[PDB]
Amino acid sequence: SWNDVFQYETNKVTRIQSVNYGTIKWILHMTVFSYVSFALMSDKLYQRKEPLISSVHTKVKGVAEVTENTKLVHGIFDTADYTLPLQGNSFFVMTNYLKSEGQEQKLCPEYPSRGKQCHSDQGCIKGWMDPQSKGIQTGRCIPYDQKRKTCEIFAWCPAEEGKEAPRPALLRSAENFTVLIKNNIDFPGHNYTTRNILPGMNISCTFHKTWNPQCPIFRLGDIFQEIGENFTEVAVQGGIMGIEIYWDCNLDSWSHRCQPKYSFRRLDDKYTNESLFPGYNFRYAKYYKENGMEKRTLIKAFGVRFDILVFGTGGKFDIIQLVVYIGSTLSYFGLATVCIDLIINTYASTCCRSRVYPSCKCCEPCAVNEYYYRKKCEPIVEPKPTLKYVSFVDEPHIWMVDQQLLGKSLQDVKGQEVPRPQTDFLELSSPDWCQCGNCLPSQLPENRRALEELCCRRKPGQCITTSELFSKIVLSREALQLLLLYQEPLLALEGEAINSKLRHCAYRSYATWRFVSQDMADFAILPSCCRWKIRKEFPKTQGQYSGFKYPY
Amino acid sequence: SWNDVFQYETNKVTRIQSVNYGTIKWILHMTVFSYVSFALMSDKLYQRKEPLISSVHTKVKGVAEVTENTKLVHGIFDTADYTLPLQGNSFFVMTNYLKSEGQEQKLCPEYPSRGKQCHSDQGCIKGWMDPQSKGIQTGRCIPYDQKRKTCEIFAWCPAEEGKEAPRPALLRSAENFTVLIKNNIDFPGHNYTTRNILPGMNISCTFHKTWNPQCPIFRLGDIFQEIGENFTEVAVQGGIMGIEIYWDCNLDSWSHRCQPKYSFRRLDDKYTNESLFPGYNFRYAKYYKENGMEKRTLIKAFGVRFDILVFGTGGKFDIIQLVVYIGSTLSYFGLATVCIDLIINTYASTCCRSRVYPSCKCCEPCAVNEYYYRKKCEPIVEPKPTLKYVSFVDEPHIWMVDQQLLGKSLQDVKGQEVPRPQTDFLELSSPDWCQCGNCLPSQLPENRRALEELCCRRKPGQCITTSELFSKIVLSREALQLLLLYQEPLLALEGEAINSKLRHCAYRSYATWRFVSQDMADFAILPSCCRWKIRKEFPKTQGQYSGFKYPY
Amino acid sequence: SWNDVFQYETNKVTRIQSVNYGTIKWILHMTVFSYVSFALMSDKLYQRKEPLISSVHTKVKGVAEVTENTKLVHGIFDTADYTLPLQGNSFFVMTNYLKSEGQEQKLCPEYPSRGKQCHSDQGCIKGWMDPQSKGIQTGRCIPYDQKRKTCEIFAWCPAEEGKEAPRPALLRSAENFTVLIKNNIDFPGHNYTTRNILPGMNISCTFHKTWNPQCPIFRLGDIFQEIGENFTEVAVQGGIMGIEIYWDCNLDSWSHRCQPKYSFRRLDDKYTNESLFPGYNFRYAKYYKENGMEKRTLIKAFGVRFDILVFGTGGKFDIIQLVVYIGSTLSYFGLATVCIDLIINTYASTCCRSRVYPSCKCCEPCAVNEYYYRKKCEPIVEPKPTLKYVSFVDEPHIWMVDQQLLGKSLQDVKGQEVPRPQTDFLELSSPDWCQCGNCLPSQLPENRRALEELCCRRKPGQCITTSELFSKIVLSREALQLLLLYQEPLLALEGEAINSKLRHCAYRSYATWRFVSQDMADFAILPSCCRWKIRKEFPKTQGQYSGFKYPY
Ligand SMILES: O=C(NC[C@]12C[C@H]3C[C@H](C[C@H](C3)C1)C2)c1cc(CCCNCCCO)ccc1Cl
Ligand SMILES: O=C(NC[C@]12C[C@H]3C[C@H](C[C@H](C3)C1)C2)c1cc(CCCNCCCO)ccc1Cl
Ligand SMILES: O=C(NC[C@]12C[C@H]3C[C@H](C[C@H](C3)C1)C2)c1cc(CCCNCCCO)ccc1Cl
Ligand SMILES: Nc1nc2c(ncn2[C@@H]2O[C@H](COP(=O)(O)OP(=O)(O)O)[C@@H](O)[C@H]2O)c(=O)[nH]1
Ligand SMILES: Nc1nc2c(ncn2[C@@H]2O[C@H](COP(=O)(O)OP(=O)(O)O)[C@@H](O)[C@H]2O)c(=O)[nH]1
Ligand SMILES: Nc1nc2c(ncn2[C@@H]2O[C@H](COP(=O)(O)OP(=O)(O)O)[C@@H](O)[C@H]2O)c(=O)[nH]1
Ligand SMILES: *[C@@H]1O[C@H](CO)[C@@H](O)[C@H](O)[C@H]1NC(C)=O
Ligand SMILES: *[C@@H]1O[C@H](CO)[C@@H](O)[C@H](O)[C@H]1NC(C)=O
Ligand SMILES: *[C@@H]1O[C@H](CO)[C@@H](O)[C@H](O)[C@H]1NC(C)=O
Ligand SMILES: *[C@@H]1O[C@H](CO)[C@@H](O)[C@H](O)[C@H]1NC(C)=O
Ligand SMILES: *[C@@H]1O[C@H](CO)[C@@H](O)[C@H](O)[C@H]1NC(C)=O
Ligand SMILES: *[C@@H]1O[C@H](CO)[C@@H](O)[C@H](O)[C@H]1NC(C)=O
Ligand code: NA
Ligand SMILES: [Zn+2]
Ligand SMILES: [Zn+2]
Ligand SMILES: [Zn+2]
Ligand SMILES: [Zn+2]
Ligand SMILES: [Zn+2]
Ligand SMILES: [Zn+2]
């Protein structure tokens, strides 16, 4: 069994000598290679990509000059007056505010905010919580002022919820503020970290798309401007602005590039419905005691929340990724073989020589694919008991009958016409169904008698036995003896077994002569006339003829 | 060399005419195709998937009515009384609180919190920082009240750290609060952004799993209820609740679907040990001066922190992804070939005809694979100097001896039995080791003499030379001359070279006759008797016979 | 057409009996298999990996003892004195502070902070906003003290911006604080969640790289120490420290492992330039009224912001991933075939036997690849009208002339030398260009006359017709009749058609004899002498000879 281990199977091939097929093969190979290489390089499919982990540190710079009040009061706003302590992925800049000082929890009328006017106590409902006015109604309409009445609520009073944001915005000068963004990113899998500020950077720069795309200092008004947003208008009600930091990082030494790209995107919907809280604000309370009572000052702060959005991937060469990609693409190099073999198979068909070619003489030189197909494919049939081959001296072709004989003579049964082989010129150099007058009834049992009910021809005429070739090949005892001696050099030409050997050799000689291929000759069926002439020449002294036996 | 460029290699094939193998091939092809198509569609392997970047904007609505104190004091809590300014990925709702007003940094007893009772100054340690009481011990036990003593600490006093959260929770009515979540998501690579609130949405809706799965307004109690959590109990100590927003987005126009799925998950461990800070709270200080001293009010706020967890991917058709997947799956279409070829190889074995088939007559019709194997595979051997073939007229097979002759006669040396070919019926139509009496001693040097020590047979009997076929094929000068003239039409039948040519042709004729295949005949070894009869017929006038020469 | 459906194509193969090629094949197969298995297991390419979603909950423990002031004042700092309410992905610990109490918006000199000294009103600019001093200049230099002058600004006064952070840091004892980190992670696609604190964990542990790698309680000084950072120095100006939590989670039951790895990384640049805001601090304002004026206390808080960075992936077995990987790797098992076939093709070349082999006798036994190549590849040519084969009795080879005859005799036209086949030994057993004296002028039209202008030889000598083999094969009427009867058993040997059949058979017999292969014989060109001898033997009674016709 060891020898069976040390075996190598190699495919048999036909190397074709063709300009067209060679050119097609090479063009297709180069097309596949070019595309797979382009996909490998463009999409970096030799790299393992890793998402980043980010830390953000923001610092807002700027002082706003304002004129509040009546009287003209001049003041300033510094960072502690308009920012929250948070300095990470989001920072808030106050641009507008409403202040309610000295609030007490008691009864008061609700602010008449765009539809809260009340005409009678019927409209007001006692005990009903209003999340807008932020109080509990008493069910009594009372006069907010000398012109309009509003429902009475138990709330922090005076109640100013629903009052409109000041216009113009009090801290609209925040458009001139600047924010410095410090961004640390890391790729833990690749063990790589970098930051967005490197040594040698200009400290007096301000970000610009073209002139200063790497300056991490942003004027807020410029942020709004770059994407066609108006800071002055957004300042009244506030909003949410996205600062996007994209890191497309190549960590291969020969192609190292890890730099941030800055972009801006408004994140709050401009057309948010009035009942859905348009803009951005929060309510901040400062609590104190005065006049022996628990009081509160309410700040409604409007402004812009800036969300720092940091995203990206880090690419480094990985062997496994490259191997997987190459393997995924290897099968595409069979395209040339598939296409050319399809061409060979299609143009070998007969439908072309008879139908396509007369209509179009351009694709007639492609008749050479018949030769290629003959050289490439060997058609064979499954050897089954019903397989039979018959040849008629009248016809030039062979008939295949792969069906049972249900008592019908094989002469009448129809089959599939198949062609005769090339013959290897180098080697060479009164039953009713009968139409020859020499056939005899079959001596087999009636169950399998139809197999032998066969004549040399389908139409009346001379029997094939009359030809001298028949006697030379089939009936010549010298020729059969020579063949047997070639197979068995020391065979004994005596006994009743020699007659059986000669009869079998004569059968095989007729079958090879009239069918050429051993594949057909093995399942060929001899005509009755030839069969009985052979048997007469080499008769069985005692016993019954078995006839055709299934080889498998 | 140009012609060598324009070549195409096509595989030689045998097309089998079988119902079973065709059916198996097509079934396997369809199975592979169906599975690869299902994998392509189910997992969207034609798409490039991109993670989203999210912005969240939350707004809590609700007013709580409370009854604090003794006396019955009625009050309300609005958003500024129970929320932090932050309104992004997390928002906090206060549900309970402990307040410590007018704290002074001085000495005081520590709160007796579940095991802090002290019986003597021995238990207390001076200068030891207690992170629980949040003070520095003095080492002196002092009376906290008229029943129990506790260690004295320098701390913000009065010290209430360790005091239990109020039960029931003061702002347990926050279960009736609602939060509106506005969620902006973007897929920068696909240049796609959308939000979770679209025009035409109902503003008076509240979220429900079935009735209103797309309403972004959530009642907090409902959040807890949907996942079997009790808001009233969690309100006492607080906790962390996750609101999950899943975006499974298909960005192909023909299959566009980008909508959020909302789910809830408690994020704080219910069974957190008492020493590990169970629930959620933080300590918030308000600082002031009174009575000429620096005082502080401490708020211990208990409540629920809601974490908004937004995740998902965006899929869009990508050509490279599709090409890579198809290539990764192409090789699976060789399964039919692998399986059917394995069947052919296995059932061609002899082990079946002798062992399996008698035991089971069901798998006997599969003997047709011997014919398929003969038509498919041509076995050949490596041509090496030791390769030799010998045939004995007694035996019906051929012997291969691929081993050196270490002085042992080739007759005695054993080899591997190999079969004789079909013979192409179409073309056809007193040394001790000697057992024939006609062999002679070898004239070669003793080093390589054993090669020629070969007889026509392994047992005593008539020599093969006695057959008339031997004289007709090997010794017939006319036949050899005819073969030579076929090879050389104008050959000259004179000189001593013609005898050498005739001798070589006779050797080749014997070798082809007794071995058929040129592969075996090329390495066949002639018996001594036949060799010397040939040499006698065509003897060398002057010189020494070289004998068998290695062709390669 | 149904039978055409039930077909199976199997490749014809040559199984080689070689130790070297079998060993090479198996070694290469095992190498490919080992590598693909290693890649599958190491990189878990049978798993679908999913990123985690995280929630973080932090709690800082610790009380700092301090000595502030002059007078010696003793105090403590508890969590509310040094932390913000936020307890999620980032927490802040105050380590140093500057306090500015009782600020009023008025005019004051700016703090002389490292280059703000002013020598005259020329340096100062009126109306110019200074983001550093956080005030608006008046353009007048005024004395900050009795030694140095500074620009006058309208700002919150007294103005202390630019004052250096205290050294040593007031809350440098925060190095002894501890933080407990609770981390909840989930893999929504795999429906898996876990936390970093499991039942049975030691509550009195502190994190250590080796002794306690799973304790989620971290001493801040230890965090700084593990990565060679000095907390005491960073405390003066502050900084940003990263706590990294890596989750490499295997969610397969047989290989379940989902545990966090803790690592630390400083996130703020140590060498940040003085103008870029080195360290970490924020300005926090407390507003009040006193003496009938609006006053503010400004806290500049320095400290360490700790960023909790949670990242990782969850792996679970997925069938589609495994199928895609196996398919991507299947083609690599053709490596053995590619390599061995390349060896066969290369060593079959002639360049070796003549050039490489004499130089190196080591690679001479590899001459056996000529036999393998002959057994593997059948070279054929494209059948085109210009294809012609000629043989000269003088030469031992065949000539191929695949070119047009532009009036030049085929004898003179040069072609490509091609070898003669093996001949199937088993089957066997006065024109100027003329050099034989028997050729005659061609009777074809002058357009195509050059094709027939061919002689049996390229040099003067005896004509091939003189050989007896020529008469036996080509001119023997009996032999041609026998061949025809073999093809047509009942052919009629009468009429003028029999002469045409005999002439064609004689042409084919000469072509097969002198070219062996039917491929060459089909496009072979007969010499004029042989052609006209054949025509004389079997002449056309009436008509003109057509000569060679293109078969395709
Ligand atoms: O509290 C204030 N800012 C803090 C803060 C800002 C932003 C984040 C956060 C929450 C909330 C919103 C409140 C902190 C504030 C201060 C001033 C003082 C300067 C103008 N007055 C100067 C006298 C004129 O001479 C005016 C108005 C406000 Cl609303
Ligand atoms: O400070 C309070 N909330 C702010 C805040 C809430 C939450 C986030 C953040 C931090 C911290 C925790 C403190 C801000 C507060 C207010 C009240 C006032 C209403 C009840 N008293 C009304 C009189 C009755 O007539 C009562 C108790 C508290 Cl704890
Ligand atoms: O306000 C303070 N901390 C709160 C806070 C801390 C950090 C986060 C955030 C923002 C900002 C920065 C302010 C909250 C504070 C408190 C003390 C009191 C204890 C020492 N004095 C005790 C008397 C001695 O007997 C001293 C100094 C300060 Cl700056
Ligand atoms: N191919 C073929 N073989 C035949 C035919 N008739 C008989 N044989 C073969 O001849 C053998 C039977 O010999 P037969 O002359 O019929 O009688 P028997 O040999 O005395 O039993 C079987 O092995 C058959 O394979 C025929 O028509 N065609
Ligand atoms: N296959 C085979 N070839 C043989 C044998 N003996 C001789 N030859 C061939 O015959 C040639 C040697 O001729 P030989 O009659 O021995 O003597 P020589 O030709 O006068 O030197 C060699 O080229 C061999 O290939 C044999 O036993 N088997
Ligand atoms: N291969 C080959 N075939 C030839 C040659 N000359 C004639 N033929 C064949 O012979 C046939 C023409 O017959 P020919 O004797 O020339 O005259 P015809 O048959 O009376 O028209 C054609 O079908 C050719 O294929 C030749 O030189 N080489
Ligand atoms: C921003 O600064 C420029 C500087 O000249 C000034 O003209 C402009 O008014 C400023 N914007 C606001 C809103 O004050
Ligand atoms: C921006 O909005 C303001 C309203 O506050 C308006 O006066 C101004 O004209 C707007 N700017 C542009 C460029 O539309
Ligand atoms: C929530 O509102 C319902 C409305 O009827 C009320 O019955 C219930 O008591 C409220 N829950 C709390 C905790 O107050
Ligand atoms: C929820 O917890 C509270 C305790 O505050 C309890 O009274 C109530 O029965 C609980 N609800 C359920 C449904 O268990
Ligand atoms: C930290 O605690 C140790 C405990 O002995 C003490 O020696 C050390 O001084 C403390 N560090 C600071 C900065 O106070
Ligand atoms: C850390 O920095 C402080 C400065 O505050 C210094 O005194 C101390 O020596 C430093 N420690 C080390 C180990 O360098
Ligand atoms: Na493949
Ligand atoms: Zn008949
Ligand atoms: Zn007949
Ligand atoms: Zn002998
Ligand atoms: Zn013998
Ligand atoms: Zn001539
Ligand atoms: Zn001639």
Author numbering:
A (entry chain C), B (entry chain B), C (entry chain A): 6 to 74, 81 to 440, 473 to 595
Original authors' sentences:
Shallow binders, represented by A438079, A839977, AZD9056, and GSK1482160, extend minimally into the classical allosteric ligand-binding site. The adamantane-containing ligand AZD9056 is also coordinated by hydrophobic interactions and two hydrogen bonds with D92 and Y298, but not with K297. This, together with the increased hydrophobicity of AZD9056, could possibly explain its modest inhibitory potency (IC50 = 330 ± 100 nM). F103 only participates in hydrophobic interactions with AZD9056, GSK1482160, and JNJ47965567. While A438079, AZD9056, and GSK1482160 demonstrated progressively less recovery after longer IC100 exposure times, none of these antagonists completely prevented channel recovery.
Predominantly expressed in immune cells, homomeric P2X7 receptors are molecular sensors for pathological inflammatory states by detecting and responding to mid-micromolar to low-millimolar local concentrations of eATP. P2X7 activation triggers signaling cascades that result in up-regulation of the NLRP3 (NOD-, LRR-, and pyrin domain–containing protein 3) inflammasome and activation of apoptotic pathways.
